[PDB]
Every structure is written in C-alpha cells, then in structure tokens.
Amino acid sequence: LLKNAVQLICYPDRIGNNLTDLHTAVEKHLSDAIGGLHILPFFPSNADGGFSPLTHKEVDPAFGTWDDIEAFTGKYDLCVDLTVNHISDESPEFRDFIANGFDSEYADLFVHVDRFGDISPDDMAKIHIRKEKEPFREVTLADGTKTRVWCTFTEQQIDLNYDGDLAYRLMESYIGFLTSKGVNLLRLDAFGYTTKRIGTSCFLVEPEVYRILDWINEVAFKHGAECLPEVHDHTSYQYAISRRNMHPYGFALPPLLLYSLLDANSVYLKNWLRMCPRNMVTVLDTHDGICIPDVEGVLPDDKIKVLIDNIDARSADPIMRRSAANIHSVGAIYQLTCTFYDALMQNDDAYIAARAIQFFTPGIPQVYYVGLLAGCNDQELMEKTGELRDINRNYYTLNEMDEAMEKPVVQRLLTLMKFRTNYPAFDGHFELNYSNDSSVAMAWRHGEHYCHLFVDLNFNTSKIQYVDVKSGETRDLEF
C-alpha cells in the first residue's frame, strides 16, 4: 500500500552527478515534502535515455549501486520502471541470439518477423507505430545469416515476445529482484505494444492486453508491489487500468489544466474531476512532454486546437504523430515540448494554482523535478544533445538546486507539498463544490479534518483553508 503523499519524479543523475547527490538533495530539501520517488531508469542502457536496459538487475556504475537505490527505501516509497516491451540488443539474452541464432536458448524471447509470412499493405498500415519506418530490424547473426526481429522503438531496443514463455519468465525475474530492493510501485512502460497480432494495430489489443496486465499485476502483488501501467492514448484505457486494480495515469490533467488556466475556463476541468478514474497517479509535467491523445474527449477538439496553437507559437517543435501533414490538427500532435512553468508563461500564481488543483485531484500526485524548481525550456541543452525532449530535462548542480529552492515560487510549492503530504483530510473522501465557469472549488474531508481549495482562473489566485483539529479554527495555508 502506497503513501498518499507527493512523489518526486527525477533522473538518477540530473541533480548533482549521481544517486548519492540525489539522496543528498532529497534529505536537504524534500524530507518533509514527499513520501516517495519515481527514479527514472538507472540500469545499464544504450538508448533512449535509460529505456533500453540491458537488465533490470544492475545499477549503471555511473549512477551508483543498489545500496544507493536502497538508501531511499525505508523512508520513501520507490517507483521504478519495468520495460515490459523490449530489452537492449546488448543484453546477454540478445547477444546470445546473435551468437547462436535459432539454436540460442533465448531465441523465443524475441519476435521473428518472418514467422508472420507476408504482411499485406493494409495490415502494415494498421500498425500503431509513431516512427516512419517499418518496426522490423534486420540483424546479422554470428554465422553471417540475416534475420529480422520486431523493433518498435530505436534499433537498440528489441521487442519481447509475449506469445512465448521466456518473456513472462524474464519479467517475473525482474519484478522479484526489484521488489527485493524495496520497489513497491512498478511503472509498466509502453505495455500497449506487448500484443503483436497481424491484422490488428498491434497496440492495446484487447482482451489480450488485460491478460498480460493481470499477470504482471498478480506477480507484483505476491512480491509486495503495485503497478503503474503507462499508456498515451484515449482516456478510456485509464479506466480499464483502474477497473483492474492497478494505478492509471492522470495524463488528461496537464493539457486540461493548461487550457483551463490559459482561457479562464473551468467547465471541462470540473466535468473531468467529477468522473476522473480511481486510484490515479496524477502528474502535471513528466519527463516526456505534454501528451495530446490523453485529453481527447476530455477537452473538445477545438479547445485542444487552441492549446496546441498557443503552445507551439511560443516554444519548441512538437513531436508529431506519424504521417500527419496537418499541424493544426488534434490528430497530428503527439506531445508538446515545453516545461510546465513555461507553458504557464512563468506566471508564478498560475503555476502554484495548477499545482494546488493537481494536489486536490484524487490520486497520488507526482511532481517532476524540473517543475519542482520552476525550470524553463532548456534550449541550450536541446541544442547540445540534439534530443528535443531535453528542452524539459534540465541538469542542475547541487548549488543550482539550493538556489532554485530559494525562489519565492518554489517556496510556495514546498509549502503546498508539505500540506498535501501531511494534512490528513486527503486520506478521506473528495468533494467537489459548485463554482462558476471561471473558477474551481475543491475539498477533502476525513472526520474532523477538512481542507478547501478555491482557484480563480481569471486572476490566478489560490486559497486553501483547513481545520487545525486541536481547536475548531479554520486557517489559511499561506502558499
């Protein structure tokens, strides 16, 4: 069972140089403000910012050791990535397949493209892939033979075969290892791609996807962990996840709030809050950029268009959906690339009000480390590395974090975070209040404990009242 407290999303090495510096900054600044951490992939990896792991059972020496990861458990919940879709081509299992071909004992762990026969143009066209190449990578075996394996992402990421047994055995092995290190929340990355079936989109193929998901959830349960399955697609999948006793993502909230604040409109936000899925992990910013498919239906299309044009006229290029020529179309944008503080135009009041609304939304709130420090678009890093998403992946030295922690806007955010992590009304029931169409009123009640948020979207004001239980007096949070 997880703590109902704010979580930090952070890299192993973007705050100081490593996991030790990370722990130093966390105890120095956040020890009363968070109850958990999502540490992004810290295993050996050769692509995609950690998500091409050679194994889930080892720490990259550049980051530290397993003792450095266990330095967090015992005081904080620990959320760690489980890359269910693929592993690195430098993993022992895949190098063995390169070395021994189909005589390898790990041969059935990978998807062999030629075992599907001819795939028709129609069936190629259905496949849900955001890259403009076929998801097939041709490799050279040790004996000079060439064979093709399924490859959704970059070529160093070779997809796992959930028609075989080896994939499930591999994942069960990772989970047992991760939970024995104190991981109690498993983020299931890109789970929607685990179902390959020609004739389908090969993405979230149901009911097959929920059987994979129930199996992982059951394995996690017997090992003391819960699951955070990650999908960027229609909101409905978030309810499917929730209804199967797993934690979905509140991916709808960031673009919904951005629109709500920017246009002084509370209509869609309140409708979403009244129906939002149970047991969410909520985010405003992530390590990825603001995802558009997650808010379809939650926000009318014309209002998503407003948000898209508003952001893209002011920040870096979005990430496009595949073969989508219409840059003003909802259906064409996958993610806007913009820090959340810059999406709100560095407006301190708007940003704190966004965080308050996040924190009064049902579910466990995650704060991304860049948003924690009110970071701006990192143009210089993006130009240094060539990775668009680095515009939202700032590095900070420990001194730079000390300095950022002194900003008025960050001190207001710390006060909120402490309140959300500690005040007991959040452990009770959510109760939305009536407001006009340009403001939001949100409350939590648990016995005598009670707190109330009012946000005016016109003027970006945030007011929290709460009951100090020893007396009956209502107090103001001062944030």
Ligand X SMILES: OC[C@H]1O[C@H](O)[C@H](O)[C@@H](O)[C@@H]1O
Q: What residue ranges bind ligand X (CB under 6 A)?
A: 48, 51, 153, 189-190, 230, 287-288
Residue 326 CB, nearest approach to a copy of itself (Å)? 5
Dmax (CA) of the chain: 79
> Which of the following is catalytic: 13, 77, 90, 230?
230
**3-state SS string over the chain?**
CCCCCCEEEECCCCECCCHHHHHHHHHHHCCCCCCEEEECCCCCECCHHHCCECCCCCCCCCCCCHHHHHCCCCCCEEEEEECCCEEECCCHHHHHHHHHHHHCCCHHHECEHHHHCCCCHHHHHHCCCCCCCCCEEEEECCCCCEEEEECCCCCCEEEECCCCCHHHHHHHHHHHHHHHCCCCEEEECCHHHHCCCCCCCCCCCCCHHHHHHHHHHHHHHHCCCEEEECCCCCCHHHHHHHCCCCCCECCCHHHHHHHHHHHCCCHHHHHHHHHCCCCCEEECCCCCCEECHHHECCECHHHHHHHHHHHHCCCCCCEECCCCCCCCCHHHEEEECCCHHHHCCCCHHHHHHHHHHHHHCCCEEEEEHHHHCCCCCCHHHHHHHCCHHHHHCCCECHHHHHHHHCCHHHHHHHHHHHHHHHCHHHHCEEEECCCCCCEEEEEEEECCEEEEEEEECCCCEEEEEEECCCCCCEEECCC
Contact status: 426 vs a copy of itself (CB under 8 A): no
Contact status: 149 vs a copy of itself (CB under 8 A): no
Burial class (CB within 10 angstroms; exposed 0-12, middle 13-18, buried 19+) of 230: buried
Does residue 172 have an active-site annotation?
A: no
Contact status: 379 vs a copy of itself (CB under 8 A): no
CA distance 370 to 9: 9
Residue 173 contacts which entry, ligand X, a copy of itself, none (Cβ below 5-8 A, type-dependent): none
Contact segment (CB under 8 A) with a copy of itself among 27-35, 67-75, 292-300, 368-376 equals 292-300
Contact status: 386 vs a copy of itself (CB under 8 A): no
Contact status: 62 vs a copy of itself (CB under 8 A): no
Does residue 189 have an active-site annotation?
A: yes
- 182 phi-psi bin (left φ>0, alpha ψ -120 to 50, beta other): left
Q: Tokens representing 302?
A: 């014309």
Residue 53 CB, nearest approach to ligand X (Å)? 10
Site string for a copy of itself, 15-34 (x = CB under 8 A): --------------------
Count residues contacting a copy of itself (CB under 8 A)?
Answer: 69
Find the binder of a copy of itself among 14, 234, 446, 449 (CB under 8 A): 234
Residue 17 contacts which entry, a copy of itself, ligand X, none (Cβ below 5-8 A, type-dependent): none
Contact status: 49 vs a copy of itself (CB under 8 A): no
Look at strands 185-188 and 77-82 and give their pairing.
parallel
Residue 372 CB, nearest approach to a copy of itself (Å)? 23
> Which of 72, 249 has the CB closer to a copy of itself?
249
Find the binder of a copy of itself among 239, 348, 409, 415 (CB under 8 A): 239
Residue 288 contacts which entry, a copy of itself, ligand X, none (Cβ below 5-8 A, type-dependent): ligand X
Find the binder of a copy of itself among 150, 174, 237, 466 (CB under 8 A): 237
Find the binder of a copy of itself among 22, 80, 220, 240 (CB under 8 A): 240
Burial class (CB within 10 angstroms; exposed 0-12, middle 13-18, buried 19+) of 330: buried
Residue 400 contacts which entry, a copy of itself, ligand X, none (Cβ below 5-8 A, type-dependent): none
Residue 458 CB, nearest approach to a copy of itself (Å)? 5
> Which of 112, 234 has the CB closer to a copy of itself?
234
Look at strands 77-82 and 157-159 and give their pairing.
unpaired
Residue 382 CB, nearest approach to a copy of itself (Å)? 16
Residue 190 contacts which entry, a copy of itself, ligand X, none (Cβ below 5-8 A, type-dependent): ligand X
Using an 8 Å Cβ cutoff, are 186 and 226 in contact? Answer: yes
Contact segment (CB under 8 A) with a copy of itself among 165-173, 201-209, 381-389, 395-403 equals 201-209
Residue 189 contacts which entry, ligand X, a copy of itself, none (Cβ below 5-8 A, type-dependent): ligand X
Within 8 A by CB and 6+ apart from 267, the residues are: 437
Residue 176 CB, nearest approach to a copy of itself (Å)? 29
Residue 190 CB, nearest approach to a copy of itself (Å)? 18
Residue 237 CB, nearest approach to ligand X (Å)? 14
> Which of the following is catalytic: 93, 159, 189, 288?
189
Contact status: 133 vs a copy of itself (CB under 8 A): yes
Residue 378 CB, nearest approach to ligand X (Å)? 16
Residue positions annotated with a catalytic role: 189, 230
In the complex, the residues that contact a copy of itself under the rule CB under 8 A are 120-122, 124-125, 132-134, 197, 199-201, 205-207, 210, 234-240, 243, 259, 261-264, 271-272, 274-275, 278, 297-298, 300-301, 306-307, 309-310, 313, 322-328, 347, 349-350, 431-436, 438-439, 443, 454, 456-461
